[PDB]
Specification:
This is part of a larger assembly, with six copies of chain A. By secondary structure, chain A is mostly beta strands. Chain A has two helices and seven strands. Chain C: Belongs to the p22likevirus portal protein family.
């Protein structure tokens, strides 16, 4: 995720009001089509936003470099159980860990 | 020859180990903390989904004069969505899982019906439940 | 006369004043989070059975669950003789910029550390937002502080539970190499000159790498 | 200067930072999913009776079942001062493209891994749909990540539970 | 006792937040004649907030955590409804609950 | 912003009248001009360490 200030255009909606469109999203595709459709530019600002880039990599080379993907956030959602930091070291635990020692004993004795 | 016997140490330690695992394998008292962590994860999921929707989806702007979907296509026939910067008009919360908006409306009407006394609003809500 | 000398003298006095409590809190965190066989000083002597049959962790889980089911938040109320609509704008701003996941996570972290060790903390910071600003193109968020026993050092001449009488406070930041580079980019520091400060952690567990860079923020 | 070198440096730092937690989580998954006699290093020495008399699996089943009985989903609510219908379209889209089996399965997998190991994850992806598009000939779906302890490696300089 | 200590911490948080809001945010002054936001911009196009010294008009307490003002208003209406007998104010509060 | 040998940022003024750090305490007090805070784990450390040893 890269957070940067990018250009945005303040047009005037032919129906009503004035809109804000990011310059990168209509950079070349329709940048001249707004004028034909009745949108005229009234202002240009610099607005800060985040962009997400994905790269496909292996241990020796980069296949895809900086493929821009949709969204302002990394699309992975994590879920944690008992989560914390001890000494700048993240630790997460469920319900099985603390029972491993006793159970391993119960298996041994029964064996 | 003496009959085989389980030593007192073996039985005592098996009982103690089983009791220890029984006592330690109790999440919370209930999984309220785990459910709250899942709720936090779903709030993050909703944030990401809202960002993606603003990026790629066609979000209409509701005028008070009606949804005015303003979009246009390029010379390459590709349509480019035009989303205004007044996009973060709603925030994220956690609620019951519903497969459709009609189910959510039905649940909301039923919830309201369970608290309204049998007056005129009760009749209104019953007719509204038969509506959906 | 030197500003660095005065800052370091204050920090050293505060650090030495609260050494025992910090050590005990760190030991509590290690005991309740990593392992109850805190035998780092002499464990590579011979191999003998060391089983962990936990009996305190269910209690900690129960207390954390109990404190989680009852959230607590600020509530602004009009003063005596003030207009009855005196606190709706401030309350709206607070609910607007404290509804995010960071605030809840920071509060939960502080509460868990308070239950386990005895002390926790969080921070309030302000940033510039251009997309969804709360007011004046700015937002206020709440950030967490992990292991507040050793990372937040308060003025030793403070006799209040909330430390509102404290006149200075030093927060120690430990961060990775990429984290340090982004910190330097954010605060316009020199990324080539790697900083250093008093290390609050202890290399006790057989962690493969505890590679960290330490800096300090001194508030007065 | 090399892009691959910088990416690999970041990945190696993050991978080495979280080695112990990942190892413990993988051990927990193996213990609770495959076998409690994790004796891979020395098992081909002699043949002796090793029985598995499980005592923890009923607890895991109970916790997973109880967490399954209370589904949790996103709910979009209008902001303060916004139009009261500000979240109807977004909520409708979310319910439209999250009603499929993949989203429920991903959430269930993440929940089970969270209960057993301590960490799980899922992903949000976007694709082009021509038969039943949600909008703009595109769909957003949720996909599962199995063993998120070792398959998802986060930035090591993150101090938030949701890694925002 | 731990919840009380957390409440003390949240009260300190509210104090700090109010100070920061007075420092950087735009706090309107409500007139009884409406919110009048009085600000101005410099020659460098930067707007500087103008906050009067009549800023500490509200004090800090501890209450339930709500995501927004609408949720708080709904909770207050529901709390009032649970204590009011089924008279005319009960109908008033029911209509107000359907309001929000 | 300081290190062990130099000051990077000197007196950057920040918003607010208070230090932006909020602490939370458990059992808090002063014994002899010495602040002591405790949670719930400390007093259980001695017995538990015994229970771990005996069972071992």
């Amino acid at each position: 995720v890269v957070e940067k200030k990018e250009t945005a255009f303040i047009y005037q909606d032919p129906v009503t009001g004035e809109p804000v469109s990011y310059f990168k999203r209509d950079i070349k595709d329709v940048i001249d089509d707004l004028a034909d459709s009745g949108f005229i530019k009234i202002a240009e600002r610099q607005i800060k936003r985040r962009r997400v880039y994905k790269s496909i990599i292996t241990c020796t080379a980069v296949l895809k470099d900086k493929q821009l993907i949709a969204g302002e956030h990394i699309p992975i959602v994590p879920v944690f159980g008992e989560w914390g930091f001890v000494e700048d070291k993240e630790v997460y635990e469920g319900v099985v860990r603390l029972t491993k020692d006793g159970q391993r004993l119960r298996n041994m004795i029964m064996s | 020859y003496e009959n085989p016997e389980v030593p007192q140490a073996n039985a005592y330690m098996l009982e103690a180990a089983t009791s220890a695992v029984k006592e330690v394998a109790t999440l919370g008292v209930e999984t309220y903390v785990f459910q709250d962590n899942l709720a936090t994860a779903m709030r993050r999921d909703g944030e990401i989904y809202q960002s993606i929707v603003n990026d790629i989806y066609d979000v209409p702007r509701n005028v008070t004069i009606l949804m005015a979907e303003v979009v246009d296509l390029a010379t390459g026939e590709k349509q480019v969505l035009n989303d205004i910067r007044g996009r973060y008009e709603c925030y994220t919360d956690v609620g019951p899982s519903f497969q459709s908006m009609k189910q959510q409306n039905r649940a909301e009407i039923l919830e309201l019906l369970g608290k309204t006394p049998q007056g005129t609003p009760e009749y209104q809500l019953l007719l509204l439940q038969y509506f959906t | 006369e030197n500003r660095l000398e005065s800052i370091l003298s204050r920090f050293d006095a505060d650090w030495t004043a609260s050494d025992e409590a910090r050590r005990e809190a760190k030991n509590d965190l290690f005991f309740s989070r990593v392992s109850q066989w805190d035998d780092w000083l002499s464990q590579y002597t011979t191999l003998q059975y060391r089983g962990q049959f936990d009996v305190v962790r269910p209690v900690v889980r129960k207390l954390v669950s109990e404190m989680r089911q009852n959230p607590i938040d600020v509530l602004y109320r009009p003063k005596d003789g003030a207009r009855p609509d005196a606190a709706d704008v401030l309350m709206g701003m607070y609910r607007t910029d404290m509804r995010h996941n960071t605030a809840k996570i920071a509060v939960n972290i502080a509460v868990r550390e308070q239950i386990e060790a005895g002390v926790g903390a969080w921070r309030l910071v302000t940033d510039y937002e251009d997309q969804s600003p709360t007011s004046n193109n700015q937002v206020i968020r709440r950030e967490p502080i992990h292991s507040a026993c050793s990372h937040v050092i308060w003025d030793s001449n403070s006799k209040l539970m909330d430390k509102s009488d404290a006149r200075h406070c030093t927060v120690i930041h430990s961060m990775s190499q990429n984290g340090w580079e982004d910190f330097a980019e954010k605060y316009d520091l020199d990324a080539d000159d790697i900083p250093s400060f008093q290390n609050p952690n202890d290399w006790v567990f057989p962690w493969l790498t505890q590679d960290t860079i330490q800096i300090a923020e001194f508030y007065e």
